[PDB]
Amino acid sequence: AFPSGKVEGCMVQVTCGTTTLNGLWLDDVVYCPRHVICTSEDMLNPNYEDLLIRKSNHNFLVQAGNVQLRVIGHSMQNCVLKLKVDTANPKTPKYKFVRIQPGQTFSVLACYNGSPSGVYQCAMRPNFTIKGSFLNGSCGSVGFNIDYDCVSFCYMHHMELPTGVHAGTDLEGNFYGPFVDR
């Protein structure tokens, strides 16, 4: 597994309504699964576009440690929510977003409400799922490779599937495989 120190300093907690999950804090932007803006009665046929319009900035509670990061904008890029905040993360590492394939390994920093609890070497199965240990709250954990001193973020966990396997996106919000957040 890759050492996790660069990524630990980016992990945050995002809460919307009933829902709380992990966010990734880079520069003045927090990335997290967009389904954070759903109460899961919305989870049957969500209109994310109508949902995101209905939210205002104070609807989003972002905390890194016991600092609040004030959200000053919210946009959506495919399936990831992008919260603009009023401060840039002074611990932002050199980073890039990359898309990978099943079979290629990466490390995942499992967190429970912005709090890191393990780092694990994973790969997606050919059907783009991943079998590990991440329940409610570990939603939003990200995966990465470290190449020299640059963190290539390649994965964000979004959902546990009925089979127990997990589905996720890349950091541009595009799901790996045919999965949907519905």
Numbering used by the authors: 7 to 188
Any passages from the paper?
The crystal structure of the catalytic domain of SARS-CoV-2 CLpro was determined at 2.27 Å resolution. There were four protomers in the asymmetric unit. Interestingly, they existed as a dimer with dimensions of ~83 × 48 × 36 Å despite the absence of the dimerization domain (domain III) known to be crucial in dimerization. In the crystal structure of the catalytic domain, dimeric interfaces were made by backbone hydrogen pairs of Ala7 N and O atoms with O (3.39 Å) and N (2.88 Å) atoms of Val125’ (the other subunit), respectively. A hydrophobic pocket composed of Pro9, Val13, Leu115’, and Val125’ also participated in the formation of a dimer. Therefore, the N-terminal loop contributed to the formation of a domain-swapped dimer by interacting with β10 of the other subunit. The first six residues (Ser1 and Met6) and the last eight residues (Gln189 to Thr196) in the LH-loop were not visible in the final model though they were predicted to form a short β-strand in PSIPRED. The five residues not well defined were due to the absence of domain III influencing a local conformation around Ser139. The crystal structure indicates that the decreased proteolytic activity of the catalytic domain was due to the incomplete construction of the substrate binding part built by the LH-loop. Enzyme kinetic studies with a FRET method revealed that the catalytic domain alone presents enzymatic activity, despite it being approximately 8.6 times less than that in the full domain.
